[PDB]
Design a protein around this ligand. Structure first.
Ligand SMILES: O=S(=O)(c1ccc2ncsc2c1)N1CCC(CCNCc2ccc(-c3ccccc3)c(Cl)c2)CC1
Ligand code: NA
Length: 330
């Protein structure tokens, strides 16, 4: 036995065709700028792996964002830098402007282009059906691009999506968990926030690909159209799969596990039970109905599949009827 192998349906060999240096980030030599070019203005936030500041480049008086890294292995910093450099200039990808080190503490800091993000509590109540379709399309452009460039984001969620609503501008941020896709590679399943983890992660299927990001995206879409954040609210990684199973149903889950010859943890056998596949109609109510259409539900259904191979690709998703008005306007 052991699990059945898997390959991405698209962009399978994009890294194989690149020079090794493109993806072999362990070999990457970091280009350091001058720390003294930046003065910190104010703290913006703190994350698992960093503290984020607004700063000013005193050479040209530009506003920038500085992410000062907490201690991480040099290869993980190299990976994030290499990915940001490879993706620089791509649609809706955050722009890495510079990389500096404090010469005393030796702490490394990434310097980004400044994006004026719109406060969540003011965005949430104003967003129309059109706005959701528009911003979803913008995220898909970033995902198609990074996938086409041989990179999985692996941490798609609202915290990692900046919107400057005034400028109708979106950026996908926090490439610290992203990885290069190589056919045959077994990845770490301990990635992404619980609520956004794909079934492949939860059942410990390591040979995953770009399609992980499409599950995460579907989770985001569900939370936005149904006004339920998070959508799949698990207590832990095990219960997370139970919450998914109560919606997608257990029949399809067991079909997926059979197809890939996945060995399910003994714990899971007790708690999965038997669940019907639910209709999306049970999440619709008077408050959210203006966001919910046949198109939205058809699209959502085609993202949220157990079987990573059957999810829409980014480029397929962009062709879905949910986006016809957006595509016409652009
Ligand atoms: O201040 S920050 O540390 C900072 C500032 C600049 C910067 N530049 C490089 S890293 C960096 C960090 N930062 C923390 C993350 C925040 C995330 C904002 N989420 C907003 C949001 C996104 C997406 C949706 C949405 C979902 C579904 C459909 C359509 C849309 C929704 Cl509703 C809201 C921004 C501020
Ligand atoms: Na693979």
């Amino acid at each position: 036995s052991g699990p059945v192998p898997s390959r991405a349906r698209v962009y399978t060999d994009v890294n194989t065709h690149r020079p090794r240096e493109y993806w072999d980030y362990e070999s990457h030599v970091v280009e350091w700028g001058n720390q003294d070019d930046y003065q910190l203005v104010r703290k913006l936030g703190r994350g698992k792996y960093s503290e984020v500041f607004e700063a000013i480049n005193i050479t040209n008086n530009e506003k920038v964002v500085v992410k000062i890294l907490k201690p991480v292995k040099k290869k993980k910093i190299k990976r994030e830098i290499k990915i940001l450099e490879n993706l620089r200039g791509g649609p809706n990808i955050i722009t890495l402007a510079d990389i500096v080190k404090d010469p005393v503490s030796r702490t490394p800091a990434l310097v980004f282009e400044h994006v004026n993000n719109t406060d969540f509590k003011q965005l949430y109540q104003t967003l129309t059906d059109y706005d959701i379709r528009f911003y979803m399309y913008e995220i898909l452009k970033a995902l198609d691009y990074c996938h086409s460039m041989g990179i999985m984001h692996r941490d798609v969620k609202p915290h990692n999506v900046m919107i400057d609503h005034e400028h109708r501008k979106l950026r996908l941020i926090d490439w610290g968990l992203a990885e290069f896709y190589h056919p045959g590679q077994e990845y770490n399943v301990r990635v992404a926030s619980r609520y956004f983890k794909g079934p492949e992660l939860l059942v410990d299927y390591q040979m995953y690909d770009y399609s992980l990001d499409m599950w995460s995206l579907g989770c985001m879409l569900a939370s936005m159209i149904f006004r339920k954040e998070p959508f799949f609210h698990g207590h832990d990684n095990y219960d997370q799969l139970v919450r998914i199973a109560k919606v997608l149903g257990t029949e399809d889950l067991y079909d997926y596990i059979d197809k890939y010859n996945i060995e399910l943890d003994p714990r899971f056998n007790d708690i999965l039970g038997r669940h019907s596949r639910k209709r999306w109609e049970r999440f619709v109510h008077s408050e959210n109905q203006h966001l919910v259409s046949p198109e939205a539900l058809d699209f959502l259904d085609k993202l949220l599949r157990y079987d990573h191979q059957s999810r829409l690709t980014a480029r397929e998703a962009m062709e879905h009827p949910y986006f016809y008005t957006v595509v016409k306007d652009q």
